[PDB]
Design a protein around this ligand. Structure first.
Ligand SMILES: Nc1cc2c(cc1Cl)N(CCC[C@@H]1CCCNC1)c1ccncc1O2
Length: 273
């Protein structure tokens, strides 16, 4: 009954993830996003408790969707002969962080601190639920403009979190760590911290630090606008070439730069309204 349960609105975007449309749940007028993924384009499959074979994203979103978190919720899913359709939460009004940075430029540090903090909390939640995102980036963060609340999207490159080495990767290369580039090997948490360093740089500078593999491997960061000494230190720590030299999530959240974070509502009042 997909076609009767949802009224389809405009296409929001398309890309490697599939095609995502604005929609409304007709029963209660709930705003949703409707994500279509072609079966031929799914490399990574999971299985539900009842035996049903599904995209990994469905498995991972179910693992994280219990209680509140900074993760966009899976509301329902449908199988068609050549595709899966996922029904996702849709804040309104909303803008992805890539579009936000593109429009507004480099973020003020107070704003970046609030956003970065919320991303860390959401990533911690995923990890606590046994899920590794593997594609943390501005394009995969939604901002609820009224509430100042950030939500993670697109678990299509994700995996079950494990303590042994990953030798597969299908996330975004420019957010991928040097050990992936050089050895095609990474561990989950330390690779996540690398991507968070890329993200933080992106927030405070308005662009990502590395384009080419050679730049990633060299790992040297330069600043084109004024960024505080403490923020620069945190970025450079997250981007340590050796995975063991990177901070843990606890170390990031205890860093001097991360102190005195604004709550989401205050963040929206100051920066978004
Ligand atoms: N609610 C919701 C839920 C979403 C997504 C968007 C919204 Cl609004 N998207 C993003 C679609 C592309 C964006 C749209 C805006 C313009 N810039 C490009 C997803 C992309 C991939 N996997 C899950 C997604 O889930």
């Amino acid at each position: 009954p997909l076609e009767s349960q949802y009224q389809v609105g405009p296409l929001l975007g398309s890309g490697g993830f599939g095609s995502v449309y604005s929609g409304i749940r007709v029963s209660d007028n709930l705003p949703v996003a409707i994500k279509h993924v072609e079966k031929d384009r799914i490399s990574d499959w999971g299985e539900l408790p009842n035996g049903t074979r599904v995209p990994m994203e469905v498995v991972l979103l179910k693992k994280v969707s219990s209680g509140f978190s900074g993760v966009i919720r899976l509301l329902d899913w449908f199988e068609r002969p050549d595709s899966f359709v996922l029904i996702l939460e849709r804040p309104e009004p909303v803008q992805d962080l890539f579009d936000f940075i593109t429009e507004r430029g480099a973020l003020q540090e107070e704003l970046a601190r609030s956003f970065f903090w919320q991303v860390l909390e959401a990533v911690r939640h995923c990890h606590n639920c046994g899920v590794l995102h593997r594609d943390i980036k501005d394009e995969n963060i939604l901002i609820d403009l009224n509430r100042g609340e950030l939500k993670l999207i697109d678990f299509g490159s994700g995996a079950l979190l494990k303590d042994t080495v990953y030798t597969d990767f299908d996330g975004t290369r420019v957010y991928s760590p040097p050990e992936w580039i050089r050895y095609h090997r990474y561990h989950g948490r330390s690779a996540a911290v690398w991507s968070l360093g890329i993200l933080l740089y992106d927030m405070v500078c308005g662009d990502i630090p590395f384009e080419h593999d050679e730049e990633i491997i060299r790992g040297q960061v330069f600043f084109r606008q004024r960024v505080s000494s403490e923020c620069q230190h945190l970025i450079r720590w997250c981007l340590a070439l050796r995975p063991s030299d990177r901070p843990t999530f606890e170390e990031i959240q205890n860093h001097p730069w991360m102190q005195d974070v604004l709550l989401p509502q205050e963040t929206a009042e100051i920066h978004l309204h």
